């Protein structure tokens, strides 16, 4: 229903729109995001918003027409499900709120976030040399030290940080053997070729195809989590895959997957990304007013505050044993 299947479709619509919009505005070869991390940090912040500030956040998050109660209860249920579905996979979903000591932050806002997001709430002195390492140290603690800094500086007039950290460490159901990894060429997006450590195995994997691409599903642990790989055919591009992705296309891939004997070649790879989502990406998705002096957050404080930055950092490492991935999203308010 609306607070079940329909909200998952809207969240995956947010995932595809966030990927498409990020890809449009960044120039790097690699893109790696956690839409779950971004929407969780923004939904904590949304509990304080009123009027058009709240409407524009809900538009960007694909949550128009949902009440705060329903967004919070859905977020709480989703988090609980992800944390317990597979004890053989390591999953972390942590949330924290850091605010200026001595300022009054409304208790219903704090309690909603403690309840539905298990947010750790801390009143800190932003001028103390202890505060930046406490915040960055929390990020390191919640990402197995894969994201060790979310901030390089705290502006003098900082009011609050709302931070989410998603962590994943899975072991392939069918691991590659490092002794089968060989040096091989990989064609880069810029047309040059590089030599990589190409992992290899032959096994049963979920597989399907469509006009553009081949698709593979690689399970982890107890098969609750998996990796979907979209490999464009010769002459087809990843840009076209990204631009055509939506709930319908994703549903068609998932429903088309069949167990198939596959000769798989996959590079060992790692990437680390950093975004300032407030600059162009969230505004293009419809979030404008919350980044301006006309933002209204009466659920947080009586003072006029706004979102100055939405920092999103990610990490992923894929190897013969599995995958380790992490994301941190920090919403800065001043």
């Amino acid at each position: 229903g609306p607070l079940g299947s329909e909200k998952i479709e809207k969240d995956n619509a947010f995932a595809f729109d966030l990927l498409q919009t990020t890809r449009k505005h960044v120039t790097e070869a690699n893109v790696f995001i956690s839409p779950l991390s971004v929407s969780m940090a923004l939904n904590m912040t949304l509990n304080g918003a009123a009027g058009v500030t709240a409407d524009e956040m809900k538009t960007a998050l694909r949550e128009t027409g949902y009440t705060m109660e329903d967004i919070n209860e859905y977020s709480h249920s989703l988090r609980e499900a992800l944390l317990k579905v597979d004890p053989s996979t390591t999953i972390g979903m942590a949330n924290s709120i850091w605010y200026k000591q001595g300022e009054l932050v409304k208790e219903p806002f704090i309690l909603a976030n403690r309840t539905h997001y298990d947010a750790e709430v801390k009143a800190v002195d932003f001028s103390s040399p202890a505060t930046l390492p406490a915040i960055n140290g929390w990020c390191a603690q919640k990402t197995n030290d894969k994201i060790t800094k979310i901030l390089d500086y705290i502006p003098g007039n900082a009011f609050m940080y709302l931070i989410n950290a998603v962590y994943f460490k899975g072991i392939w159901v069918t691991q590659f053997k490092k002794s089968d990894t060989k040096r091989a060429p990989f064609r880069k997006a810029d047309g040059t070729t590089q030599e990589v450590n190409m992992m290899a195995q032959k096994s049963t994997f979920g597989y399907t195809t469509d006009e553009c691409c081949q698709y593979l599903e690689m399970d982890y642990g107890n098969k609750a989590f998996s990796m979907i790989v979209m490999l464009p055919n010769e002459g087809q591009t990843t840009r076209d895959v990204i631009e055509q992705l939506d709930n319908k296309h994703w549903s068609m891939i998932i429903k088309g997957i069949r167990p198939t004997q596959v000769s798989l070649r996959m590079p060992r790879f790692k990437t680390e990304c950093k975004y300032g989502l407030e600059k162009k990406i969230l505004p293009e998705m419809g979030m404008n007013v919350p980044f301006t002096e006309t933002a209204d957050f009466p659920g947080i404080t009586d003072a006029a505050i706004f979102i100055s930055r939405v920092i999103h950092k990610t990490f992923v490492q894929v190897d013969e044993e599995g995958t380790e991935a992490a994301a941190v999203t920090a919403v800065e308010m001043k």
Binding site: A29, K188, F225, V262, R265
Partner: protein
């Protein structure tokens, strides 16, 4: 068997099946270590 040889750019996602949610998604145009 079918060949699935990742020797050029690809899109990938990490999902969970009971909720259907996408935890991570991205594009790899360059392999780094």
């Amino acid at each position: 068997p079918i060949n699935f040889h990742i020797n050029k750019p690809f899109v990938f996602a990490i999902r969970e099946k009971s909720t259907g949610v996408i935890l991570f998604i991205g594009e790899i145009g360059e392999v780094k270590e």
